[PDB]
PDB file of C-alpha atoms in Angstrom:
ATOM      1  CA  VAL A 102     -26.470  12.688   0.529  1.00 12.60           C
ATOM      2  CA  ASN A 103     -28.440   9.448   0.039  1.00 13.53           C
ATOM      3  CA  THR A 104     -28.214  10.082  -3.738  1.00 12.83           C
ATOM      4  CA  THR A 105     -24.660   8.966  -4.598  1.00 13.18           C
ATOM      5  CA  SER A 106     -25.843   7.156  -7.747  1.00 12.39           C
ATOM      6  CA  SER A 107     -24.089   8.903 -10.656  1.00  8.86           C
ATOM      7  CA  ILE A 108     -20.825   9.137  -8.715  1.00  9.34           C
ATOM      8  CA  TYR A 109     -21.042   5.358  -8.290  1.00  8.09           C
ATOM      9  CA  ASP A 110     -21.784   4.904 -12.009  1.00  8.27           C
ATOM     10  CA  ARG A 111     -19.060   7.166 -13.412  1.00  7.71           C
ATOM     11  CA  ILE A 112     -16.698   6.227 -10.563  1.00  8.48           C
ATOM     12  CA  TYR A 113     -17.456   2.506 -10.670  1.00  7.35           C
ATOM     13  CA  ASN A 114     -17.209   2.711 -14.467  1.00  6.46           C
ATOM     14  CA  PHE A 115     -14.210   5.046 -14.311  1.00  5.56           C
ATOM     15  CA  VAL A 116     -12.898   2.793 -11.543  1.00  4.58           C
ATOM     16  CA  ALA A 117     -13.185  -0.029 -14.069  1.00  6.85           C
ATOM     17  CA  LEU A 118     -11.598   1.689 -17.068  1.00  6.46           C
ATOM     18  CA  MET A 119      -9.117   4.033 -15.408  1.00  9.08           C
ATOM     19  CA  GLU A 120      -7.818   1.339 -13.051  1.00 10.54           C
ATOM     20  CA  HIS A 121      -7.578  -0.979 -16.013  1.00 12.26           C
ATOM     21  CA  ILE A 122      -5.321   1.858 -17.180  1.00 10.60           C
ATOM     22  CA  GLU A 123      -3.892   2.038 -13.654  1.00  8.64           C
ATOM     23  CA  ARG A 124      -3.223  -1.700 -13.902  1.00 10.52           C
ATOM     24  CA  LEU A 125      -0.208  -0.459 -15.926  1.00 12.33           C
ATOM     25  CA  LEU A 126       0.105   3.271 -15.178  1.00 14.65           C
ATOM     26  CA  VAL A 127      -0.261   3.161 -11.385  1.00 15.34           C
ATOM     27  CA  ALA A 128       1.242  -0.349 -11.546  1.00 14.19           C
ATOM     28  CA  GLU A 129       4.319   1.153 -13.187  1.00 15.92           C
ATOM     29  CA  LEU A 130       7.543  -0.862 -13.161  1.00 15.39           C
ATOM     30  CA  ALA A 131      10.414  -1.799 -15.527  1.00 17.59           C
ATOM     31  CA  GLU A 132      12.697  -1.151 -13.885  1.00 15.18           C
ATOM     32  CA  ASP A 133      12.824   1.574 -11.267  1.00 14.57           C
ATOM     33  CA  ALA A 134      13.037   5.098 -12.810  1.00 13.54           C
ATOM     34  CA  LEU A 135      12.685   6.004  -9.107  1.00 13.87           C
ATOM     35  CA  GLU A 136      10.973   2.686  -8.239  1.00 15.68           C
ATOM     36  CA  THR A 137       8.021   2.800 -10.639  1.00 15.31           C
ATOM     37  CA  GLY A 138       8.713   5.731 -11.622  1.00 16.63           C
ATOM     38  CA  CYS A 139       7.561   7.588  -8.476  1.00 17.49           C
ATOM     39  CA  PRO A 140       5.581   4.927  -6.561  1.00 18.12           C
ATOM     40  CA  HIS A 141       4.274   7.579  -4.171  1.00 17.74           C
ATOM     41  CA  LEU A 142       2.621   8.854  -7.319  1.00 14.26           C
ATOM     42  CA  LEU A 143       2.249   5.416  -8.901  1.00 17.99           C
ATOM     43  CA  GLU A 144       1.812   2.712  -6.247  1.00 16.42           C
ATOM     44  CA  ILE A 145      -0.056   5.077  -3.931  1.00 20.67           C
ATOM     45  CA  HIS A 146      -2.119   6.162  -6.933  1.00 18.03           C
ATOM     46  CA  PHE A 147      -3.009   2.476  -7.003  1.00 16.73           C
ATOM     47  CA  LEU A 148      -3.607   2.724  -3.248  1.00 16.97           C
ATOM     48  CA  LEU A 149      -6.141   5.550  -3.488  1.00 14.61           C
ATOM     49  CA  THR A 150      -7.414   3.969  -6.701  1.00 17.11           C
ATOM     50  CA  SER A 151      -7.779   0.920  -4.433  1.00 19.06           C
ATOM     51  CA  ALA A 152      -9.211   3.208  -1.740  1.00 21.67           C
ATOM     52  CA  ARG A 153     -11.748   4.405  -4.274  1.00 20.38           C
ATOM     53  CA  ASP A 154     -11.974   0.666  -4.964  1.00 21.89           C
ATOM     54  CA  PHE A 155     -12.107   0.091  -1.231  1.00 21.68           C
ATOM     55  CA  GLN A 156     -15.699   0.915  -2.049  1.00 23.50           C
ATOM     56  CA  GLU A 157     -15.312  -2.431  -3.859  1.00 25.80           C
ATOM     57  CA  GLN A 158     -12.806  -3.941  -1.388  1.00 23.15           C
ATOM     58  CA  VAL A 159     -13.547  -2.671   2.142  1.00 21.28           C
ATOM     59  CA  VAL A 160     -16.914  -0.996   1.574  1.00 21.67           C
ATOM     60  CA  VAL A 161     -17.876  -4.040  -0.409  1.00 24.75           C
ATOM     61  CA  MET A 162     -17.789  -5.481   3.115  1.00 25.63           C
ATOM     62  CA  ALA A 163     -19.789  -2.446   4.262  1.00 27.84           C
ATOM     63  CA  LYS A 164     -22.249  -2.566   1.338  1.00 28.49           C
ATOM     64  CA  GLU A 165     -23.409  -6.095   2.145  1.00 28.70           C
ATOM     65  CA  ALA A 166     -27.005  -6.041   0.812  1.00 26.81           C
ATOM     66  CA  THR A 167     -27.606  -2.330   1.369  1.00 23.30           C
ATOM     67  CA  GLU A 168     -30.368  -1.568  -1.158  1.00 21.75           C
ATOM     68  CA  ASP A 169     -29.775  -3.484  -4.421  1.00 20.74           C
ATOM     69  CA  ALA A 170     -28.129  -6.589  -5.875  1.00 20.10           C
ATOM     70  CA  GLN A 171     -25.912  -5.178  -8.651  1.00 20.01           C
ATOM     71  CA  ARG A 172     -24.126  -2.598  -6.475  1.00 22.11           C
ATOM     72  CA  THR A 173     -21.519  -5.300  -5.857  1.00 18.06           C
ATOM     73  CA  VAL A 174     -22.299  -7.520  -8.871  1.00 15.62           C
ATOM     74  CA  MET A 175     -22.469  -5.334 -11.977  1.00 15.36           C
ATOM     75  CA  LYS A 176     -19.774  -3.235 -10.300  1.00 17.33           C
ATOM     76  CA  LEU A 177     -17.854  -6.441  -9.497  1.00 17.61           C
ATOM     77  CA  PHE A 178     -16.860  -6.831 -13.142  1.00 20.78           C
ATOM     78  CA  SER A 179     -16.128  -3.117 -12.772  1.00 20.26           C
ATOM     79  CA  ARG A 180     -14.016  -4.192  -9.774  1.00 19.50           C
ATOM     80  CA  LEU A 181     -12.154  -6.959 -11.627  1.00 20.84           C
ATOM     81  CA  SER A 182     -10.249  -4.234 -13.458  1.00 20.71           C
ATOM     82  CA  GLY A 183     -11.150  -1.940 -10.550  1.00 18.52           C
ATOM     83  CA  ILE A 184     -10.144  -3.497  -7.217  1.00 17.58           C
ATOM     84  CA  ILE A 185      -7.556  -6.206  -7.912  1.00 16.60           C
ATOM     85  CA  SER A 186      -6.189  -4.031 -10.712  1.00 16.10           C
ATOM     86  CA  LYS A 187      -5.616  -1.315  -8.092  1.00 13.91           C
ATOM     87  CA  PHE A 188      -4.938  -3.227  -4.856  1.00 16.06           C
ATOM     88  CA  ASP A 189      -2.649  -5.754  -6.537  1.00 15.91           C
ATOM     89  CA  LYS A 190      -1.398  -2.849  -8.657  1.00 18.09           C
ATOM     90  CA  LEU A 191      -0.455  -1.303  -5.324  1.00 15.80           C
ATOM     91  CA  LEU A 192       0.917  -4.758  -4.425  1.00 13.90           C
ATOM     92  CA  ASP A 193       2.853  -5.124  -7.657  1.00 14.65           C
ATOM     93  CA  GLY A 194       3.983  -1.569  -6.938  1.00 12.10           C
ATOM     94  CA  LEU A 195       4.407  -2.464  -3.250  1.00  9.61           C
ATOM     95  CA  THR A 196       6.191  -5.798  -3.649  1.00  5.46           C
ATOM     96  CA  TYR A 197       8.105  -4.106  -6.467  1.00  5.10           C
ATOM     97  CA  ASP A 198       8.448  -1.027  -4.244  1.00  5.17           C
ATOM     98  CA  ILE A 199      10.036  -2.879  -1.318  1.00  3.83           C
ATOM     99  CA  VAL A 200      11.726  -5.150  -3.858  1.00  2.34           C
ATOM    100  CA  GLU A 201      12.791  -1.919  -5.552  1.00  2.00           C
ATOM    101  CA  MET A 202      13.821  -0.815  -2.059  1.00  2.00           C
ATOM    102  CA  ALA A 203      15.802  -4.093  -1.929  1.00  2.16           C
ATOM    103  CA  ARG A 204      18.076  -2.836  -4.730  1.00  2.36           C
ATOM    104  CA  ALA A 205      21.326  -1.698  -3.055  1.00  2.00           C
ATOM    105  CA  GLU A 206      20.725   2.083  -2.971  1.00  2.00           C
ATOM    106  CA  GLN A 207      17.564   1.866  -3.103  1.00  2.00           C
ATOM    107  CA  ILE A 208      17.235   4.855  -3.776  1.00  2.00           C
ATOM    108  CA  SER A 209      17.336   8.417  -2.414  1.00  3.49           C
ATOM    109  CA  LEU A 210      14.131   9.039  -4.404  1.00  3.78           C
ATOM    110  CA  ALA A 211      13.031   5.478  -5.278  1.00  5.21           C
ATOM    111  CA  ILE A 212      12.780   4.253  -1.684  1.00  8.41           C
ATOM    112  CA  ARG A 213      11.647   7.750  -0.683  1.00 10.33           C
ATOM    113  CA  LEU A 214       8.578   7.701  -2.941  1.00 14.34           C
ATOM    114  CA  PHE A 215       8.117   3.917  -2.772  1.00 16.67           C
ATOM    115  CA  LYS A 216       8.525   3.671   0.996  1.00 16.09           C
ATOM    116  CA  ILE A 217       6.426   6.834   1.403  1.00 19.24           C
ATOM    117  CA  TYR A 218       3.601   4.953  -0.315  1.00 19.65           C
ATOM    118  CA  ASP A 219       4.521   1.962   1.880  1.00 20.45           C
ATOM    119  CA  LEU A 220       4.079   4.041   5.047  1.00 21.80           C
ATOM    120  CA  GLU A 221       1.148   6.137   3.901  1.00 25.65           C
ATOM    121  CA  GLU A 222      -1.016   3.226   2.794  1.00 23.72           C
ATOM    122  CA  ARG A 223       0.734   0.979   5.318  1.00 26.23           C
ATOM    123  CA  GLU A 224      -0.134   2.972   8.447  1.00 22.11           C
ATOM    124  CA  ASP A 225      -3.347   4.160   6.787  1.00 22.45           C
ATOM    125  CA  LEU A 226      -4.155   0.489   6.199  1.00 23.38           C
ATOM    126  CA  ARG A 227      -3.215  -0.194   9.827  1.00 23.69           C
ATOM    127  CA  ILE A 228      -5.615   2.401  11.216  1.00 20.22           C
ATOM    128  CA  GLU A 229      -8.108   1.311   8.548  1.00 23.22           C
ATOM    129  CA  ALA A 230      -8.243  -2.395   9.379  1.00 25.85           C
ATOM    130  CA  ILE A 231      -7.744  -1.266  12.983  1.00 27.91           C
ATOM    131  CA  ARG A 232     -10.941   0.718  12.454  1.00 23.65           C
ATOM    132  CA  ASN A 233     -12.613  -2.424  11.100  1.00 25.34           C
ATOM    133  CA  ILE A 234     -11.212  -4.570  13.906  1.00 26.44           C
ATOM    134  CA  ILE A 235     -12.336  -1.663  16.071  1.00 25.66           C
ATOM    135  CA  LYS A 236     -15.630  -1.944  14.251  1.00 26.68           C
ATOM    136  CA  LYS A 237     -15.767  -5.460  15.679  1.00 25.26           C
ATOM    137  CA  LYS A 238     -14.250  -4.030  18.900  1.00 22.88           C
ATOM    138  CA  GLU A 239     -16.381  -0.893  18.788  1.00 22.84           C
ATOM    139  CA  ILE A 240     -19.217  -3.233  17.821  1.00 22.90           C
ATOM    140  CA  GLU A 241     -17.988  -5.682  20.465  1.00 24.46           C
ATOM    141  CA  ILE A 242     -18.064  -2.544  22.608  1.00 27.59           C
ATOM    142  CA  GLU A 243     -21.401  -1.514  21.092  1.00 26.63           C
ATOM    143  CA  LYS A 244     -23.476  -4.333  19.556  1.00 23.86           C
ATOM    144  CA  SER A 245     -22.171  -6.783  22.157  1.00 29.48           C
ATOM    145  CA  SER A 246     -23.523  -4.232  24.599  1.00 29.11           C
ATOM    146  CA  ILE A 247     -26.810  -4.599  22.679  1.00 27.63           C
ATOM    147  CA  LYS A 248     -27.052  -8.208  21.473  1.00 29.76           C
ATOM    148  CA  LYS A 249     -24.835  -9.386  24.351  1.00 25.37           C
ATOM    149  CA  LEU A 250     -26.458  -6.946  26.789  1.00 23.17           C
ATOM    150  CA  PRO A 251     -27.532  -9.765  28.136  1.00 23.16           C
ATOM    151  CA  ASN A 252     -31.262  -9.171  27.732  1.00 24.34           C
TER     152      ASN A 252
ATOM    153  CA  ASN S 303      13.354  -6.914   6.493  1.00 25.47           C
ATOM    154  CA  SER S 304      12.776 -10.362   4.997  1.00 29.00           C
ATOM    155  CA  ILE S 305      14.196  -9.065   1.720  1.00 28.47           C
ATOM    156  CA  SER S 306      17.406  -8.380   3.599  1.00 30.57           C
ATOM    157  CA  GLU S 307      16.551 -11.417   5.760  1.00 28.11           C
ATOM    158  CA  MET S 308      15.646 -13.408   2.654  1.00 29.08           C
ATOM    159  CA  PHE S 309      18.477 -11.852   0.679  1.00 30.90           C
ATOM    160  CA  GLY S 310      20.627 -12.362   3.784  1.00 31.07           C
ATOM    161  CA  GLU S 311      19.352 -15.897   4.335  1.00 34.40           C
ATOM    162  CA  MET S 312      19.651 -16.314   0.557  1.00 31.31           C
ATOM    163  CA  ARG S 313      23.289 -15.154   0.687  1.00 30.89           C
ATOM    164  CA  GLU S 314      24.261 -18.179   2.786  1.00 28.65           C
ATOM    165  CA  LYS S 315      24.982 -20.496  -0.203  1.00 28.37           C
ATOM    166  CA  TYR S 316      24.989 -23.422   2.162  1.00 28.70           C
ATOM    167  CA  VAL S 317      28.271 -25.246   1.540  1.00 25.32           C
ATOM    168  CA  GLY S 318      29.699 -22.755   2.895  1.00 25.53           C
ATOM    169  CA  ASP S 319      31.576 -21.838  -0.324  1.00 27.34           C
ATOM    170  CA  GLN S 320      34.845 -22.229   1.424  1.00 29.30           C
ATOM    171  CA  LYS S 321      33.512 -23.687   4.650  1.00 28.70           C
ATOM    172  CA  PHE S 322      31.871 -20.753   6.514  1.00 28.12           C
ATOM    173  CA  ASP S 323      31.469 -17.878   4.028  1.00 27.62           C
ATOM    174  CA  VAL S 324      27.702 -17.718   4.633  1.00 27.43           C
ATOM    175  CA  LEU S 325      27.974 -14.685   6.921  1.00 25.42           C
ATOM    176  CA  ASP S 326      30.336 -12.979   4.457  1.00 26.69           C
ATOM    177  CA  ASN S 327      27.669 -12.250   1.852  1.00 23.94           C
ATOM    178  CA  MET S 328      24.922 -12.652   4.470  1.00 22.29           C
ATOM    179  CA  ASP S 329      26.483 -10.071   6.785  1.00 21.12           C
ATOM    180  CA  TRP S 330      27.170  -8.010   3.661  1.00 18.87           C
ATOM    181  CA  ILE S 331      23.391  -8.072   3.246  1.00 19.93           C
ATOM    182  CA  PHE S 332      23.281  -7.090   6.924  1.00 19.68           C
ATOM    183  CA  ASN S 333      25.360  -4.014   6.084  1.00 19.86           C
ATOM    184  CA  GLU S 334      22.899  -3.442   3.242  1.00 21.26           C
ATOM    185  CA  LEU S 335      20.200  -4.079   5.857  1.00 21.00           C
ATOM    186  CA  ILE S 336      21.552  -1.256   8.018  1.00 25.95           C
ATOM    187  CA  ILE S 337      21.940   1.018   4.989  1.00 24.91           C
ATOM    188  CA  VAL S 338      18.509   0.113   3.597  1.00 24.91           C
ATOM    189  CA  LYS S 339      17.042   0.280   7.112  1.00 25.65           C
ATOM    190  CA  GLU S 340      18.318   3.757   8.029  1.00 27.83           C
ATOM    191  CA  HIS S 341      17.791   4.879   4.431  1.00 28.29           C
ATOM    192  CA  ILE S 342      14.174   3.723   4.617  1.00 26.99           C
ATOM    193  CA  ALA S 343      13.570   5.368   7.998  1.00 26.10           C
ATOM    194  CA  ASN S 344      15.035   8.451   6.352  1.00 23.53           C
ATOM    195  CA  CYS S 345      12.431   7.703   3.674  1.00 25.03           C
ATOM    196  CA  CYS S 346       9.383   6.461   5.596  1.00 26.07           C
ATOM    197  CA  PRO S 347       8.708   7.100   9.311  1.00 22.75           C
ATOM    198  CA  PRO S 348       5.507   5.089   9.774  1.00 21.22           C
ATOM    199  CA  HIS S 349       6.435   1.788   8.122  1.00 18.16           C
ATOM    200  CA  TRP S 350       8.550   0.182   5.348  1.00 16.53           C
ATOM    201  CA  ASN S 351      11.644  -1.052   7.233  1.00 18.41           C
ATOM    202  CA  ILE S 352      12.346   1.650   9.814  1.00 15.15           C
ATOM    203  CA  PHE S 353      15.065  -0.248  11.684  1.00 13.85           C
TER     204      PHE S 353
ATOM    205  CA  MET Q   1     -10.882   8.183 -12.816  1.00 14.93           C
ATOM    206  CA  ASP Q   2      -8.334   6.183 -10.801  1.00 15.64           C
ATOM    207  CA  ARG Q   3      -6.103   8.989  -9.512  1.00 13.48           C
ATOM    208  CA  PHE Q   4      -8.064   8.797  -7.011  1.00 12.12           C
ATOM    209  CA  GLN Q   5      -7.955  12.380  -5.682  1.00 11.65           C
ATOM    210  CA  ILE Q   6      -5.223  12.229  -4.709  1.00 11.66           C
ATOM    211  CA  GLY Q   7      -3.183   9.043  -4.899  1.00 13.29           C
ATOM    212  CA  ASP Q   8      -0.387  10.937  -6.622  1.00 11.23           C
ATOM    213  CA  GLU Q   9       0.326  13.239  -3.666  1.00 11.26           C
ATOM    214  CA  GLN Q  10      -2.368  13.477  -0.987  1.00 11.22           C
ATOM    215  CA  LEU Q  11      -2.942   9.747  -0.396  1.00  9.94           C
ATOM    216  CA  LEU Q  12       0.795   9.165  -0.380  1.00  9.18           C
ATOM    217  CA  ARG Q  13       0.617  12.043   2.120  1.00  8.59           C
ATOM    218  CA  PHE Q  14      -0.836   9.761   4.791  1.00 10.40           C
ATOM    219  CA  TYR Q  15       2.759   9.496   6.000  1.00 12.48           C
ATOM    220  CA  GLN Q  16       5.017  11.240   3.373  1.00 13.40           C
ATOM    221  CA  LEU Q  17       8.129  11.500   5.550  1.00 12.91           C
ATOM    222  CA  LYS Q  18      10.273  11.532   2.380  1.00 12.46           C
ATOM    223  CA  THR Q  19      11.818  14.890   1.501  1.00 11.41           C
ATOM    224  CA  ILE Q  20      12.607  15.075  -1.253  1.00  9.74           C
ATOM    225  CA  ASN Q  21      11.576  12.446  -3.764  1.00  8.13           C
ATOM    226  CA  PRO Q  22       9.145  14.611  -3.550  1.00  6.00           C
ATOM    227  CA  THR Q  23       6.280  12.577  -5.084  1.00  7.13           C
ATOM    228  CA  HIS Q  24       3.935  13.398  -2.127  1.00  8.86           C
ATOM    229  CA  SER Q  25       2.868  16.723  -0.648  1.00  7.50           C
ATOM    230  CA  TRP Q  26       2.613  16.989   3.134  1.00  3.65           C
ATOM    231  CA  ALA Q  27       3.376  16.096   5.803  1.00  4.09           C
ATOM    232  CA  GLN Q  28       3.153  13.540   8.585  1.00  3.66           C
ATOM    233  CA  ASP Q  29       1.786  10.183   9.736  1.00  4.20           C
ATOM    234  CA  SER Q  30       0.532  10.783  13.294  1.00  2.25           C
ATOM    235  CA  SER Q  31      -0.717  13.790  15.256  1.00  2.00           C
ATOM    236  CA  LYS Q  32      -1.954  12.273  18.544  1.00  3.31           C
TER     237      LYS Q  32
END
């Protein structure tokens, strides 16, 4: 379980190439065709592709000098087409999802899929950054019971 | 809610296009804000413009 | 990869209160 190397090589490399592909496929637009088409498939595919690249977005802030130097450097060029081509792909699909949900119907399947991505990754993002703010509040509960013991 | 409150605030056309027709298209975007609101809570319970 | 097992259905299934786009499997957003 401390041997996640090849998954990080084929999934950081496949996170590079396939989210370069998901910089258009999961960042689908033009125009709606049910909002991407299907932004619960598309924009939330860029959300989980950005949750697999939350290894390069949120667990880049967890892997802060863990064991090596190129885990977030040689994979950072694998996160240029990996993280901001998935997170902003979910934000082109999310700003174009809610903008697609700002389109007068909008629609019975376009805002269903699009808003379903924008509640799934929205509330999942809320409990996620609430788990990181509760990592500074569970660390403020925990490490500030250790560093700020006071002893 | 700021796409119906930026479409709504954008539908002011501050003249007011006769003298006070800002809330005509703006409140029309408020009717589209109720329809998009309840349609989106029919779509998404957790977030994305419930009400 | 960038699906990412499964951003098509199961990661849109973190809420998925939208029946039926369907575009997302099942089911809810909170169980507390």
